[PDB]
Enzyme design. Sequence first.
Site, mmCIF file in Angstrom:
data_model
loop_
_atom_site.group_PDB
_atom_site.id
_atom_site.type_symbol
_atom_site.label_atom_id
_atom_site.label_comp_id
_atom_site.label_asym_id
_atom_site.label_seq_id
_atom_site.Cartn_x
_atom_site.Cartn_y
_atom_site.Cartn_z
ATOM 1 N N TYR A 25 -45.661 7.168 -19.730
ATOM 2 C CA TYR A 25 -46.149 5.722 -20.169
ATOM 3 C C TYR A 25 -45.107 4.635 -20.191
ATOM 4 N N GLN A 28 -44.022 2.566 -14.894
ATOM 5 C CA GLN A 28 -45.175 2.958 -13.877
ATOM 6 C C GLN A 28 -46.146 3.472 -14.629
ATOM 7 N N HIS A 107 -41.985 8.887 -6.166
ATOM 8 C CA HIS A 107 -40.565 8.842 -5.433
ATOM 9 C C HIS A 107 -40.386 10.242 -5.029
ATOM 10 N N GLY A 133 -43.731 -2.372 -13.003
ATOM 11 C CA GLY A 133 -44.704 -2.160 -13.476
ATOM 12 C C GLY A 133 -45.521 -3.677 -13.841
ATOM 13 N N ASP A 190 -35.410 4.096 -0.652
ATOM 14 C CA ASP A 190 -35.670 3.634 -2.318
ATOM 15 C C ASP A 190 -34.276 3.602 -2.751
ATOM 16 N N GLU A 225 -27.244 -22.759 -10.579
ATOM 17 C CA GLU A 225 -27.270 -23.064 -9.130
ATOM 18 C C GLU A 225 -27.425 -21.495 -8.403
ATOM 19 N N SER A 253 -34.069 -29.929 2.379
ATOM 20 C CA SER A 253 -33.656 -31.126 2.723
ATOM 21 C C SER A 253 -32.852 -31.043 4.268
HETATM 22 N N1 LIG Z 1 -39.564 1.805 -12.351
HETATM 23 C C1 LIG Z 1 -40.139 1.243 -11.254
HETATM 24 O O1 LIG Z 1 -40.210 0.072 -10.804
HETATM 25 C C2 LIG Z 1 -40.606 2.606 -10.387
HETATM 26 C C3 LIG Z 1 -41.366 1.938 -9.025
HETATM 27 C C4 LIG Z 1 -41.464 3.094 -8.205
HETATM 28 C C5 LIG Z 1 -41.377 4.353 -8.624
HETATM 29 N N2 LIG Z 1 -40.893 4.873 -9.773
HETATM 30 C C6 LIG Z 1 -40.942 6.181 -10.249
HETATM 31 O O2 LIG Z 1 -41.865 6.295 -11.087
HETATM 32 C C7 LIG Z 1 -41.546 7.634 -11.988
HETATM 33 C C8 LIG Z 1 -41.440 6.967 -13.419
HETATM 34 O O3 LIG Z 1 -40.170 6.057 -13.636
HETATM 35 P P1 LIG Z 1 -40.441 4.847 -14.493
HETATM 36 O O4 LIG Z 1 -39.673 3.650 -13.955
HETATM 37 O O5 LIG Z 1 -41.454 4.459 -15.086
HETATM 38 O O6 LIG Z 1 -39.579 5.626 -15.768
HETATM 39 P P2 LIG Z 1 -39.429 5.265 -17.039
HETATM 40 O O7 LIG Z 1 -37.853 5.350 -17.479
HETATM 41 O O8 LIG Z 1 -40.039 3.916 -17.691
HETATM 42 O O9 LIG Z 1 -40.118 6.787 -17.851
HETATM 43 C C9 LIG Z 1 -40.301 6.572 -19.327
HETATM 44 C C10 LIG Z 1 -41.643 7.428 -19.531
HETATM 45 O O10 LIG Z 1 -40.797 8.876 -19.009
HETATM 46 C C11 LIG Z 1 -41.017 9.909 -20.266
HETATM 47 N N3 LIG Z 1 -39.967 10.687 -20.352
HETATM 48 C C12 LIG Z 1 -38.584 10.302 -20.223
HETATM 49 N N4 LIG Z 1 -37.696 11.484 -20.201
HETATM 50 C C13 LIG Z 1 -38.695 12.510 -20.321
HETATM 51 C C14 LIG Z 1 -38.468 13.907 -20.351
HETATM 52 N N5 LIG Z 1 -37.223 14.544 -20.215
HETATM 53 N N6 LIG Z 1 -39.535 14.646 -20.432
HETATM 54 C C15 LIG Z 1 -40.906 14.168 -20.295
HETATM 55 N N7 LIG Z 1 -40.995 12.910 -20.153
HETATM 56 C C16 LIG Z 1 -39.842 11.911 -20.247
HETATM 57 C C17 LIG Z 1 -41.068 8.879 -21.382
HETATM 58 O O11 LIG Z 1 -41.842 9.498 -22.666
HETATM 59 C C18 LIG Z 1 -41.913 7.662 -21.015
HETATM 60 O O12 LIG Z 1 -43.498 8.271 -20.856
HETATM 61 C C19 LIG Z 1 -40.084 7.941 -11.267
HETATM 62 O O13 LIG Z 1 -40.354 9.069 -10.389
HETATM 63 C C20 LIG Z 1 -39.595 6.840 -10.611
HETATM 64 O O14 LIG Z 1 -38.859 6.978 -9.596
HETATM 65 C C21 LIG Z 1 -40.331 3.763 -10.655
HETATM 66 N N1 LIG Z 2 -35.923 -30.377 -1.089
HETATM 67 C C1 LIG Z 2 -35.359 -30.183 -2.193
HETATM 68 O O1 LIG Z 2 -35.696 -29.218 -2.916
HETATM 69 C C2 LIG Z 2 -34.311 -30.990 -2.716
HETATM 70 C C3 LIG Z 2 -34.049 -30.712 -4.257
HETATM 71 C C4 LIG Z 2 -33.439 -31.602 -4.764
HETATM 72 C C5 LIG Z 2 -32.765 -32.807 -4.265
HETATM 73 N N2 LIG Z 2 -33.321 -33.389 -2.965
HETATM 74 C C6 LIG Z 2 -32.694 -34.427 -2.460
HETATM 75 O O2 LIG Z 2 -34.114 -35.220 -2.536
HETATM 76 C C7 LIG Z 2 -34.035 -36.344 -1.260
HETATM 77 C C8 LIG Z 2 -35.366 -36.082 -0.533
HETATM 78 O O3 LIG Z 2 -35.243 -34.697 0.147
HETATM 79 P P1 LIG Z 2 -36.345 -34.010 0.760
HETATM 80 O O4 LIG Z 2 -35.977 -32.591 0.579
HETATM 81 O O5 LIG Z 2 -37.428 -34.281 -0.143
HETATM 82 O O6 LIG Z 2 -36.561 -34.587 2.032
HETATM 83 P P2 LIG Z 2 -37.671 -34.540 3.170
HETATM 84 O O7 LIG Z 2 -36.917 -33.920 4.661
HETATM 85 O O8 LIG Z 2 -39.099 -33.584 2.847
HETATM 86 O O9 LIG Z 2 -37.942 -35.874 3.371
HETATM 87 C C9 LIG Z 2 -39.046 -36.470 4.313
HETATM 88 C C10 LIG Z 2 -39.225 -37.841 3.770
HETATM 89 O O10 LIG Z 2 -38.041 -38.701 4.064
HETATM 90 C C11 LIG Z 2 -38.712 -39.608 4.980
HETATM 91 N N3 LIG Z 2 -37.742 -40.057 5.956
HETATM 92 C C12 LIG Z 2 -36.920 -39.251 6.932
HETATM 93 N N4 LIG Z 2 -36.224 -39.688 7.750
HETATM 94 C C13 LIG Z 2 -36.410 -41.163 7.248
HETATM 95 C C14 LIG Z 2 -35.777 -42.250 7.725
HETATM 96 N N5 LIG Z 2 -34.662 -42.381 8.669
HETATM 97 N N6 LIG Z 2 -35.972 -43.699 7.025
HETATM 98 C C15 LIG Z 2 -36.823 -43.526 6.280
HETATM 99 N N7 LIG Z 2 -37.583 -42.565 5.576
HETATM 100 C C16 LIG Z 2 -37.370 -41.312 6.191
HETATM 101 C C17 LIG Z 2 -39.829 -39.203 5.748
HETATM 102 O O11 LIG Z 2 -40.807 -40.234 5.931
HETATM 103 C C18 LIG Z 2 -40.607 -38.372 4.259
HETATM 104 O O12 LIG Z 2 -40.969 -39.165 3.507
HETATM 105 C C19 LIG Z 2 -32.723 -36.106 -0.958
HETATM 106 O O13 LIG Z 2 -31.760 -37.015 -1.286
HETATM 107 C C20 LIG Z 2 -32.341 -34.553 -1.049
HETATM 108 O O14 LIG Z 2 -31.054 -34.159 -1.085
HETATM 109 C C21 LIG Z 2 -33.941 -32.250 -2.258
HETATM 110 C C1 LIG Z 3 -36.396 -3.243 -10.276
HETATM 111 C C2 LIG Z 3 -36.090 -2.480 -8.784
HETATM 112 C C3 LIG Z 3 -34.669 -2.931 -8.573
HETATM 113 C C4 LIG Z 3 -36.123 -0.906 -9.036
HETATM 114 C C5 LIG Z 3 -36.532 -0.204 -7.655
HETATM 115 C C6 LIG Z 3 -37.962 0.286 -8.253
HETATM 116 O O1 LIG Z 3 -39.145 0.010 -7.391
HETATM 117 C C7 LIG Z 3 -37.886 1.658 -8.297
HETATM 118 O O2 LIG Z 3 -37.974 2.387 -7.071
HETATM 119 C C8 LIG Z 3 -37.012 2.277 -9.681
HETATM 120 O O3 LIG Z 3 -36.713 3.506 -9.330
HETATM 121 O O4 LIG Z 3 -36.803 1.896 -10.479
HETATM 122 C C1 LIG Z 4 -34.748 -24.773 -0.729
HETATM 123 C C2 LIG Z 4 -33.619 -24.741 -1.531
HETATM 124 C C3 LIG Z 4 -32.536 -23.986 -0.550
HETATM 125 C C4 LIG Z 4 -32.978 -26.046 -1.273
HETATM 126 C C5 LIG Z 4 -31.831 -26.694 -2.205
HETATM 127 C C6 LIG Z 4 -32.565 -27.834 -2.785
HETATM 128 O O1 LIG Z 4 -32.402 -27.629 -4.216
HETATM 129 C C7 LIG Z 4 -31.982 -29.082 -2.411
HETATM 130 O O2 LIG Z 4 -30.891 -29.173 -2.928
HETATM 131 C C8 LIG Z 4 -32.220 -29.402 -0.991
HETATM 132 O O3 LIG Z 4 -31.013 -30.251 -0.739
HETATM 133 O O4 LIG Z 4 -32.832 -28.928 -0.370
HETATM 134 MG MG LIG Z 5 -36.664 4.089 -7.362
HETATM 135 MG MG LIG Z 6 -29.393 -30.174 -1.756
HETATM 136 MG MG LIG Z 7 -30.284 -28.302 -4.699
HETATM 137 MG MG LIG Z 8 -38.517 1.255 -5.663
#
Ligand SMILES: NC(=O)c1ccc[n+]([C@@H]2O[C@H](COP(=O)([O-])OP(=O)(O)OC[C@H]3O[C@@H](n4cnc5c(N)ncnc54)[C@H](O)[C@@H]3O)[C@@H](O)[C@H]2O)c1
Ligand SMILES: NC(=O)c1ccc[n+]([C@@H]2O[C@H](COP(=O)([O-])OP(=O)(O)OC[C@H]3O[C@@H](n4cnc5c(N)ncnc54)[C@H](O)[C@@H]3O)[C@@H](O)[C@H]2O)c1
Ligand SMILES: CC(C)CC[C@@H](O)[C@@H](O)C(=O)O
Ligand SMILES: CC(C)CC[C@@H](O)[C@@H](O)C(=O)O
Ligand SMILES: [Mg+2]
Ligand SMILES: [Mg+2]
Ligand SMILES: [Mg+2]
Ligand SMILES: [Mg+2]
Lengths: 340, 343
Positions: A25, A28, A107, A133, A190, A225, A253
Site C-alpha cells: 500500500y 504504487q 517491474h 502514484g 527502468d 533558474e 523569446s
Molecule cells: N514507485 C514507483 O513509482 C514505481 C513505479 C513502477 C513500478 N514500481 C514497482 O512497484 C513495486 C512497489 O514499489 P513502490 O515504489 O510502491 O514501493 P514502496 O517503497 O512504496 O513500498 C512500500 C510498501 O511495501 C511494503 N513492504 C516493504 N518492505 C516489505 C517486506 N519486506 N515485506 C513485505 N512488504 C513490504 C510496505 O508495507 C508497503 O506496503 C516495486 O516492484 C517497484 O519496482 C514502482
Molecule cells: N517567453 C518567455 O517566457 C519570456 C519570459 C520572460 C521574459 N521574456 C521577455 O519578454 C519580452 C517579450 O518576449 P516574448 O517571448 O513574449 O516574445 P514573442 O516572440 O512572443 O513576441 C511576439 C510579439 O512581439 C511583436 N514583435 C515582434 N517583432 C517586432 C518588431 N520588430 N517590432 C514590434 N513588435 C514586434 C509581435 O507583434 C508580437 O506581439 C522579451 O523582452 C523577452 O526577453 C520572455
Molecule cells: C520517481 C521516478 C524517478 C522513479 C522511477 C519509477 O517509475 C519507478 O520505476 C521506481 O522504481 O520508483
Molecule cells: C521557454 C523557456 C525556455 C524560456 C526562458 C524564458 O523564461 C524567457 O527568459 C525567454 O527568453 O524565453
Molecule cells: Mg523502477
Molecule cells: Mg529569456
Molecule cells: Mg527566462
Molecule cells: Mg519506473
Amino acid sequence: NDLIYQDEHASLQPLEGRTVAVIGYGIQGRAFAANLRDSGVAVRVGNIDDRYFELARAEGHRVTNIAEAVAHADIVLLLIPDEAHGAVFDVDIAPNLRDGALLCVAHGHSLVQGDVRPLPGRDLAMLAPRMYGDPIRRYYLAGQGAPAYFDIVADHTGRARDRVLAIARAVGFTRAGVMALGYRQETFLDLFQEQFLAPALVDLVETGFQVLVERGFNPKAALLEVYGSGQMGKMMLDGADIGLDEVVALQGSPTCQVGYHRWRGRTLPTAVRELAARVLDQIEGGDFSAYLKEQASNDYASLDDARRAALKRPLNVAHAQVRAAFRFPTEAAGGLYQAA
Amino acid sequence: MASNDLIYQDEHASLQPLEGRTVAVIGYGIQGRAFAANLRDSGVAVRVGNIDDRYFELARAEGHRVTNIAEAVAHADIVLLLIPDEAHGAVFDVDIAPNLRDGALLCVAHGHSLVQGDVRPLPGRDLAMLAPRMYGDPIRRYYLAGQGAPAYFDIVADHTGRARDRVLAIARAVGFTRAGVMALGYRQETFLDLFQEQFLAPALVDLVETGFQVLVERGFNPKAALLEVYGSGQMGKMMLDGADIGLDEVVALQGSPTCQVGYHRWRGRTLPTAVRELAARVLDQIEGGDFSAYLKEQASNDYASLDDARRAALKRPLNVAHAQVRAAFRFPTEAAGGLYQAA
Ligand SMILES: NC(=O)c1ccc[n+]([C@@H]2O[C@H](COP(=O)([O-])OP(=O)(O)OC[C@H]3O[C@@H](n4cnc5c(N)ncnc54)[C@H](O)[C@@H]3O)[C@@H](O)[C@H]2O)c1
Ligand SMILES: NC(=O)c1ccc[n+]([C@@H]2O[C@H](COP(=O)([O-])OP(=O)(O)OC[C@H]3O[C@@H](n4cnc5c(N)ncnc54)[C@H](O)[C@@H]3O)[C@@H](O)[C@H]2O)c1
Ligand SMILES: CC(C)CC[C@@H](O)[C@@H](O)C(=O)O
Ligand SMILES: CC(C)CC[C@@H](O)[C@@H](O)C(=O)O
Ligand SMILES: [Mg+2]
Ligand SMILES: [Mg+2]
Ligand SMILES: [Mg+2]
Ligand SMILES: [Mg+2]
Ligand code: NA
C-alpha cells in the site's frame, strides 16, 4: 510492430465477480487500490505490520496480512520493494495462490533474478506503470492515465492477457496506452532511467547552480533558474506532450531560441555517453543486482545515510531557503486516495 | 547573505497605484498575451500596442483595445515593452520615447536591452525591469487558480519616486506577488536568464537525447526509450515536483527502494569536469558581449538561421520518435481554447 492497448482494446468484464489482492500500500499499491475500488472492482489489501497497514485501514480498505489476502484473491498484485519479492513469494504467496489465479509484478527485476517464478496451474504477468502514484491517482480522477508496459510470462488459463489488461483499464493506464514489452527489457530500461538519466539531470541542475554561485550570482536566483521556479520542469513536462525542441520554438523569446540553438547538440563530451554505456553494462550483467542485494542489508541502512547526507548539500540548503521565501503552486492532497 | 534578499508577496503590494491609470501592453506574444489577460481580469485598464501581424488580430479576437504601438504609448500611464529584445532599440527610439507621457513608467521583462543601451532612462520618466521566471501559459493557468510564478524586478530610473509601488502593483495584478518578486539588478538578470537558455536548457535536452541514443543503439524499443527519457512525463513530473519539495526529496518520497539505491549509486558522480568548464565558457560568451554580437547577426535577417535550426531539429531521431510515440500514446492535457478570454 508495437502492440499498444487503449480503452477500446480492454474491458472490466474479466474482473466480474473476482477479488483483487493488492500486496503493499506504498507509492504504487495505494494508487492501484484506490483506482480499482473507484472502478467498481472488489479489492483487498495484504500488508505487513507497519504504517501502511494502518493507512489502508484509515482509507476504508479490507486489510489483512499478505497470506490471508492472497488466499481470498483471484488476482494478486505484488506492489512491495523488489528485494522483498523472493521471501514474500516463497512464504506468503506461492503456498496460497488459488489454482487459475493471476500474479502480477510492476517491474521485471524479481522475474530476471528468478525470485518470482511461474507456478503450475497459475498465470504470471508484469504490468509496469511508467509514472509514480500521485500522478496515476490525479490522472485517474481527471479521466486520464499514465502509460504502462505489460508482459504475459505464464498463462495456464489462456485468460491472463485480458485479465492483466482489465486491471490496466481499471487503474487508468489504457487511457494513455499499455504497450507489450518483455520483462527483462523493462527491468534494464527502468533501472537505466533511475541510475543514468535521473541522477545526470539532477547533477546537471546542481552543476548549473554551483557554477552560477562560483561566478558571484545570487544563490536564490541561481536555484530558481536551474529548477526552483518550475520553468525547467514545465519545459520537460510540456515537452512530453509536444516535443522538447518544440516547447522552445513555441514558448521561447527569439533571444531564448537563438541562445538555445547555439549550444543544442553541443553541450556534452563523449564521457557522458560512455558513462551511460557503463551504467547499462552494470544493469545488464548483474553488478547492480549484487549492489542492491547488499544495500537491502539492515533495512537499507546505507540508503538512509545517503538520503540524510543529500539534504545537507548546498543545492538542498538553498532549496529550503527559496521554498520558505517563494510560494510554489500546489493543490490540496488530503483525501486524494479516499473513495470518489 | 540570504537575509539581504528583498522579496515582495501580496502583503507587500497593492492595486491602489493603478487606480485611474491605463497600462499599454506593447506586444501580444508569449508574455504580452498573459500580461494583458491578467491585468484585465485584475480590474486594470489595459490597451494593446502591436505592429500589423497575426498578434494584432489575436488581441482584437480576445476583446482588447488594439492600436499601433505609438498610439498605445500616447494613451498610457505605464508601458510594458513585451516584444523580442533585438527589436527594443528601434521601437524605443521611434515609437516609445517620443510618445511616453511625463511621469509615465516604462517596464522591460529582460535586462538585455538595458545592458546594451538600446533602452535608456528618459528625463521626467520612470524605467524598470519586471522579469517573469516562467513562460505565458503557466502564468495564465496559475493566475486563474489563484497562484503565480516568481519574477525579478529592478528600478532603473525613478523620476516620480513612485516607480517601485507601480512596478509591484503591475506584479500583483499579473500574479507574480502570489509566488514572490525579488529585487535583482537588470545586468545580473540578463546574464542569469541567458545562462539558463544557453547552458542549462540545451544540456538537459542533450542529456535526454544521449539517453535515447544509447538505448536505441543497445537494441531497446525506441518508443519505450523515448517514453522513459521524457515522453512518459515522469522526468518532467520529477523536475516540477522537485521545484516544490526538492529533487533529492522527490526520489526519497516517490521512488521504490530499488530506484533510490540506483539513483544514490550515481548521484553526484555522472558528469566529468568538462561539463562545468563548458558552463563557464557559456557564461564568458554571455558576460563579454560575444553572445550579444551573435544574437544581433541572427536577428539582422528576420532570424532566417533560427528558422533553419528549428526545421533541422524536428528531423533529429529524438523528434521523429516523439511524433511516433505521441500518435500512439494519449498524453494528459487540459483544453486551452479561450484561456486568455475575459474571466
Ligand atoms: N514507485 C514507483 O513509482 C514505481 C513505479 C513502477 C513500478 N514500481 C514497482 O512497484 C513495486 C512497489 O514499489 P513502490 O515504489 O510502491 O514501493 P514502496 O517503497 O512504496 O513500498 C512500500 C510498501 O511495501 C511494503 N513492504 C516493504 N518492505 C516489505 C517486506 N519486506 N515485506 C513485505 N512488504 C513490504 C510496505 O508495507 C508497503 O506496503 C516495486 O516492484 C517497484 O519496482 C514502482
Ligand atoms: N517567453 C518567455 O517566457 C519570456 C519570459 C520572460 C521574459 N521574456 C521577455 O519578454 C519580452 C517579450 O518576449 P516574448 O517571448 O513574449 O516574445 P514573442 O516572440 O512572443 O513576441 C511576439 C510579439 O512581439 C511583436 N514583435 C515582434 N517583432 C517586432 C518588431 N520588430 N517590432 C514590434 N513588435 C514586434 C509581435 O507583434 C508580437 O506581439 C522579451 O523582452 C523577452 O526577453 C520572455
Ligand atoms: C520517481 C521516478 C524517478 C522513479 C522511477 C519509477 O517509475 C519507478 O520505476 C521506481 O522504481 O520508483
Ligand atoms: C521557454 C523557456 C525556455 C524560456 C526562458 C524564458 O523564461 C524567457 O527568459 C525567454 O527568453 O524565453
Ligand atoms: Mg523502477
Ligand atoms: Mg529569456
Ligand atoms: Mg527566462
Ligand atoms: Mg519506473
Ligand atoms: Na541570496
